[PDB]
């Protein structure tokens with residue numbers, strides 16, 4: 001019935017979704033050769049949400065591989081769970097956007113987008129009709145914010161009422177890899193604010209802080225960081241694949257979290273997250289799942305949520321648990337953190353319980369929540385944009401590829417007033 | 427990497443096991459009281 005077409009673009013999108021399909025296959029008992037093992041009825045009655053029958057009993061993902069240089073597409077196929085993907089769902093580029101939003105969107109992203117609208121429409125119309133699209137990409141590099149951003153654009157007018165999940169990583173405050181950071185951010189946030197139903201914010205140092213202060217892992221790899229995001233983005237869609245006492249889909253997450261259609265930027269958390277040496281010392285019940293839940297270190301968003309106001313929050317609980325333990329724990333963290341929640345929406349908090357837990361854990365919970373504490377990223381990318389736009393720095397790489405700079409000021413306009421609307425709600 | 431075995435079960439299939447039916451065979455037996463006499467006579471037949 002419900003069907004989620006996963007779309008992943010750029011090097012970071014393909015790498016982060018290799019870990020996504022790694023945990024979905026593990027959760028659903030899928031051998032990397034496509035066959036099934038695990039003799040449980042709860043594994044396979046909802047498998048069309050992410051997979052498809054392929055007249056051989058094996059399950060191919062509904063994943064649209066996208067990259068504009070063939071570098072990481074060879075590595076994602078050669079890795080474990082790499083032969084699960086259909087080779088036709090890959091789309092190959094030959095030049096590669098060199099961290100350039102301009103040419104990745106206008107002059108050479110135009111010829112590859114015709115061959116990939118063939119495959120996203122193939123997956124859309126193959127079923128009876130779908131539920132939503134989830135797009136994983138970068139907003140700091142060129143092939144993610146240049147190419148997948150335009151893909152996000154034209155899938156609106158062809159499927160307007162469909163839900164658009166999207167996970168995006170952002171330019172970082174402290175370390176600045178990909179030296180043209182704010183240009184690939186500001187130009188794509190303009191598109192994303194008017195062409196995405198809901199967007200979820202990931203930061204690289206927020207992932208590094210989770211891997212350091214909560215996981216106590218001395219050596220973080222990019223597969224380790226991708227595992228954290230991938231575990232979070234399976235929890236946001238547990239109830240689509242497994243039953244529970246209180247079910248919710250992406251549309252339930254949408255209608256409860258966005259009151260005004262223009263602000264849809266969310267903070268993501270994941271619990272539990274124990275150290276490898278502190279797993280056996282720490283209890284596992286709803287009062288401590290919900291108290292690690294509202295911690296600044298717990299988010300994969302690098303903004304302090306005490307600096308803003310929680311406009312709306314929600315929690316996808318997972319595992320067998322008391323319904324009124326969940327009820328008592330949301331109400332306790334409202335009326336004790338009274339200054340942290342906005343006043344004019346009574347009981348800002350939403351809950352859903354997915355009865356089947358993730359593997360190896362008795363219970364878990366995933367955070368999706370709109371906060372006005374995301375504003376300090378929008379002005380941080382903004383003043384970094386205008387400090388080097390005022391000096392005409394690195395504009396010739398952009399304006400020579402087909403861009404004119406009239407959307408540079410009006411992206412600044414259409415992002416400084418994101419700051420303005422997020423301001424008065426605290 | 428190993429494949430950890432799937433332990434997952436829902437509230438319906440844990441709580442709503444087919445229950446043993448109650449053992450009911452108990453009617454309400456009532457005993458009819460034995461009939462009372464008609465030792466009753468009229469004045470005409472007892473005096474005349």
Ligand SMILES: Nc1nc2c(ncn2[C@@H]2O[C@H](COP(=O)(O)OP(=O)(O)O)[C@@H](O)[C@H]2O)c(=O)[nH]1
Nearest residue numbers: 010011012015138141142143144177178204222
């Ligand atoms: N979350 C995540 N971020 C990554 C990964 N690999 C690289 N990055 C970040 O992405 C930035 C460079 O992105 P880039 O490769 O240009 O994105 P592209 O547009 O898809 O090519 C760097 O600052 C890295 O911190 C990954 O596997 N996961």
